[PDB]
Amino acid sequence: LKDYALEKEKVKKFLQEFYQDDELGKKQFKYGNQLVRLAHREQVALYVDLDDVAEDDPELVDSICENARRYAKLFADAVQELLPQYKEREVVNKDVLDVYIEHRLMMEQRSRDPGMVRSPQNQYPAELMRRFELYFQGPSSNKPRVIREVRADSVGKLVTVRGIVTRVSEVKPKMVVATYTCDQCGAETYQPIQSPTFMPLIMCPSQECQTNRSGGRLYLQTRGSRFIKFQEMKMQEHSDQVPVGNIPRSITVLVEGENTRIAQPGDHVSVTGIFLPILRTGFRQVVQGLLSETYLEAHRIVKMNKSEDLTREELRQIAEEDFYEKLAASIAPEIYGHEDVKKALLLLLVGGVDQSPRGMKIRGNINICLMGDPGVAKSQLLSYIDRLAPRSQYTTGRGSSGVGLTAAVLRDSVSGELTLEGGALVLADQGVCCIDEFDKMAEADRTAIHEVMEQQTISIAKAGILTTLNARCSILAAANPAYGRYNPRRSLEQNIQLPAALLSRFDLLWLIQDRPDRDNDLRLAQHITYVHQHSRQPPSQFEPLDMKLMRRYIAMCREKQPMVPESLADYITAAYVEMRREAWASKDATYTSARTLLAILRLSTALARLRMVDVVEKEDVNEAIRLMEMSKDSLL
Amino acid sequence: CNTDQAGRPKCPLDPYFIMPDKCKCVDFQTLKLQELPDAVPHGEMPRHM
Amino acid sequence: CNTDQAGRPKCPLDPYFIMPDKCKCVDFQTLKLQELPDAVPHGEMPRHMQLYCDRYLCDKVVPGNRVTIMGIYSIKKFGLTTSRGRDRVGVGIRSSYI
Amino acid sequence: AGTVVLDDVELREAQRDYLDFLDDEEDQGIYQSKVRELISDNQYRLIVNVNDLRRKNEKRANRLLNNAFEELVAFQRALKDFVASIDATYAKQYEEFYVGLEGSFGSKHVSPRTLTSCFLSCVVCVEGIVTKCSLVRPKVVRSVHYCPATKKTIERRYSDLTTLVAFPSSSVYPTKDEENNPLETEYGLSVYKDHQTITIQEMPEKAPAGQLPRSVDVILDDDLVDKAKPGDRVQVVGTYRCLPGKKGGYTSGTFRTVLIACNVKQMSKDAQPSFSAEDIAKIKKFSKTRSKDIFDQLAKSLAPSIHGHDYVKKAILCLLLGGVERDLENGSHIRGDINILLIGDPSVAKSQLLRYVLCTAPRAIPTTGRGSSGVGLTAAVTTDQETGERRLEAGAMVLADRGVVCIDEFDKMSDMDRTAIHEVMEQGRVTIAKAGIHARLNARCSVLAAANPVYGRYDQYKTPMENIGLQDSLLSRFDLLFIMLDQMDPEQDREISDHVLRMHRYRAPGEQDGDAMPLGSAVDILATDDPNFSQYEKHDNLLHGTKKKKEKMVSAAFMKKYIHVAKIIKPVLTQESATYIAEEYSRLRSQDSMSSDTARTSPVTARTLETLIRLATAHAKARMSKTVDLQDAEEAVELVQYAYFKKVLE
DNA sequence: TTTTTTTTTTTTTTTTTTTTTTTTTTTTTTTTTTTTTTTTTTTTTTTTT
DNA sequence: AAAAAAAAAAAAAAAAAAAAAAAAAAAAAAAAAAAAAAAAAAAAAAAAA
């Protein structure tokens, strides 16, 4: 229907003279600078934003979106043909692939004889000589689709879908162009690869071996061949776009090149790509016809809401003396009360600083167990923290138990062998694992959680598995202490009903009891009725921060390693020995150990991180001790 | 037939037909050469080639 | 192809494909018959027989039924191509059924 | 070959008859309006009631049902002609328009067991349960290839030879130009139709109780693919056909059969309603007339066979109406479902109420104490074993999303199961994970549960805490908790017994005259239509299901229609209602709320405040109020006050 | 311009070669699929002081 | 309440037959054509007053 020479001229014009004011209102020829970087081998992937193309050619964007492989090829050809005139100097031959490329170019010019007409099969394939990758950032005018609804009418189209990454393979070499050499001739044979499998060539087709009518057997070689980084990921529908009685639908995304190593399992991503078929050869198929598998060919992978990858006033509120309180009060502002609980949860999000002295690691993660009466927002707070934290996993009861927490060995699909997949504690490694209904958790899981919370590893020596998993996750647990309710007739450690080891692993065991109280029940009921009435928490002095903003603040506080002075050591020691003396003297106290002191230290370093200082001060210690004291306040 | 498609069935045994328009033909003549009359031995039939 | 008279140029080897919608199919069931428990000699494995039922004999019985079968003792006729693997040292043997 | 047909007589006559049937203007206008409605809904399949054809054309109806393939080709050509007559551009958009069939297939209505070989090339209506679904795959029907050397563009057509003979020339994919230039396929310009295969099994409740199940394979093509998921109960109407085998020089005479669906419909003919203008007007007048005691009238009309339990019936009406989910902007969630627990003495009709809700509500799932254990109640994770990949499997509570789970003998469940129910009951979702997959399944279901107290009979001299055996966290999930006692008072006994004997005397009107209730022996069901997949006076005529003519009761069909309309209402808490509810909650949390020798049946937590809000919202929905007024709040508060306290005797 | 011998020369065939066309044609392995075991990893009912 | 059991009960791996599918696959004979040559009849031009 359309002339592709005209379309290649169109895309060449767009690339050469599209400009914006991205750097401070300065017209900079957005794609010309990238073409320069591509010509100097300083940049591999070029992402073409179809919003830019629509700004000056909307029907080009529609053509791109309705036959996307064709236009990925056209754009790659335009870039190939534009690169020679954007080269300002000589490439330094970054790697071995470059050495091969420029030897091939050198030998082609050397024996050129330009006026001669060569065979169409006697040049280098285009993809053998690129060293750049071209991708589309789909137009914002295209609404994201639901994985279920990406069907046969969208084969060959540029679509965006959103989902959770459930399974992503390791980066592997996928061959793009197979290179062979001959035992007779000294030419190279090239086999561009489109299929999922190929039959390696046997004879060479070289001119010099066709003249000689020799054997000319050719030898497949990795050296001159071309590979690409390749990952296979599965991606699932979000819970909120699954129909009523259904389970979420997966799509296979074939990730390759510079788009690899972006998405890890558990990530919320938005993927732009082309929806393409893979022919289903071989299977003696019940139905006649050319049936094929589908996949998404990735072009742009963007990590979404919690997986997401400052103005002077922003730093102003960071430097505000009430920043800690404002962040803590932004924790699930629809739950009334629980002010100190939200402070403790904020500290869990920030965490302490890991210490590695002389080969003896002590974690920086903070663990918190909310053990409360029924209906006190424990599951709501757990769910909020799961929504907010960047690498969080939520588990409940025994729906994700055993290998849903640890790893399991699973049949690989890409090659077919036994690959290790992590459960919740691996997907939450270096994040938060929210373990709801902790008191009703299978004992094998509880022992695994012992090792996770202190050693930050999972050791497995079962039949198919002999490994040690990294599980460097904070544990936010929720439980009911004994028989559903806290009764004062029985001591702690009797209605807590956690062994001293497990109990001591938690930096804070927060006790919540909802004792009835007329004015307090009115305050809660008014808050809740307002929330039911307006779908939001009532106005207060300070508007709560967005979850994006909260994430940014917490992240900035994360890389803020503060140290403990020598001057505080006596103060901290006195606090520890004091806590320990109440534990001994009191008859209704929990188990106190050196873990209580480490809890003091890491709580206070998390406070200091929140002030974004580099040295823990006495007020940080003071607030940490107050938190440890409040954690058992309800029993008074 | 060279082409394969395992999902599809195979082509017949002798499937190939000359396409006459896609053929490079050249001129072609056959001659009859007789031994030169002055080269034939005396009582002797001439040879042909 | 038997009709190679309606034109001089010929048809290939094996030109024929089954026309599935032009075939008259009938019902078809296979039964496993075991020797009656009272008829098995004392220390003795039971004998079995494969049964082949047809149009209205299909679904006339269910597993567990005691039946009396009347039929042709017959062998499978699928083309004297016996190339089995590890077992079957036996030559000239074909599967029996009724 | 290469022959064309010159005005085939039978195809011409058939297409004429079908276009006469479709062009309904001198007649009632049914199918002409239906074709307009598919044009406007942007769809390309018309579902035709075969009874309408029988009414208009016996000869067509019989010929269509017995020779399905060519008849359906004629009727789809006629449909395309008719659609073009109404709207030529729409007809231009879609290559072919399709025809699904529905209605009453007399002898063609079969089960997977009864679908024998005598129905080959006939239209059949098969009912069963989907055991396996394939992935939805695209099947290429028109491929477009560009030749970069010559700049030429090529198109190849692939005809649907699923059940026809397919010679290998019909399936070659072009890869080379005539002079061996490579072609590149234009994926975006090619046309694909997606293809699925499912297996339908004879429903376990309908299969002969002894033997193994019988199945049939079904080919689903575009528009029909994702209509059914494993575990669904479906009708599939389609053509039963032999598939071709592969090319070979030898054949056993054995053919593999499938059903090519022309229509798929769910058993849940209770999950899709049909409202005419008169129905809507009747609903609107019923809501406007008595907008005060309409709720009581609906409640007392709920399980008419059960006498008494007025509060329990009001609560069940609130459960069937529901509250409103709060979906906060930060993704936070408050549920809007009501969960009810019925504790009580033996034989007080709580199973009857569960059975009523099972036969009344849409998307209602039944489950008993130990008959659904572990993963059969919430979801499960299994491994595909063909691809080696993990798969999700939906349990009872996932399948009841936006529905009800009626858990009978709740006390006889395991504690493992009862603690698995916690997350579904409160947060409305199932979170399950094995190593290769983690999901969060929506189970937005309300739980109606019936249990017996410990000791089987409720001891009135012990506190309700120790008669119910449930811990406080579980009890908190159930927002209403009814103790249904067997008070052996003679007056109440007379009331109950008179009612029961009247229901044991009732005989259906005219349908019966002294006869017995048939067993329905698996050949009688296929004789008639299935009521499950089948195709309003606001009141019932009074005979002796009621003693005297003093107070009318709502028709069951109208009550279904009314509740379906009222469920969509989203009433808003007004400030007076919110203040009243808050004050009542603070009073109810306090000790003065309970006198001496009265005891709490369930704890009062913040969940009780949301219980009040949800009950008031459901009450407001019953009136179609759009606001939660003070009357709704005080009805909710009296429900809670009634259910949450119990006097203990000495 | 009546008679009369070589001359072809059109018509029967026959040979006869060279070339193009015609005619003939199941068996044997392999592989997926289904339905079985079988070791191992849980996990769900058993009891005590 | 936990501590051994003692089953399901799921997976991976194996077998293990079937039953279907897939894969191999030129040379010998004939006829027709076009060309020759050969027996016969037929049609020419030299004879004379």
Ligand SMILES: Nc1ncnc2c1ncn2[C@@H]1O[C@H](COP(=O)(O)OP(=O)(O)OP(=O)(O)O)[C@@H](O)[C@H]1O
């Ligand atoms: N400040 C608050 N305190 C208590 N409950 C609240 C508060 N704010 C809101 N709620 C309500 O509590 C209800 C949820 O119960 P929740 O999620 O607290 O159970 P839980 O704390 O896990 O208790 P359980 O121990 O029974 O599991 C939510 O609907 C929420 O709206």
Ligand SMILES: Nc1ncnc2c1ncn2[C@@H]1O[C@H](COP(=O)(O)OP(=O)(O)OP(=O)(O)O)[C@@H](O)[C@H]1O
């Ligand atoms: N108002 C009523 N009160 C009690 N029983 C009634 C009433 N109306 C009818 N029944 C009859 O009582 C019989 C027994 O009721 P059902 O079996 O539902 O009791 P149940 O409460 O489930 O007993 P259990 O707790 O032992 O299961 C039913 O046949 C029902 O029809």
Ligand SMILES: [Mg+2]
């Ligand atoms: Mg909870």
Ligand SMILES: [Mg+2]
């Ligand atoms: Mg009952």
Ligand SMILES: [Zn+2]
């Ligand atoms: Zn060579």
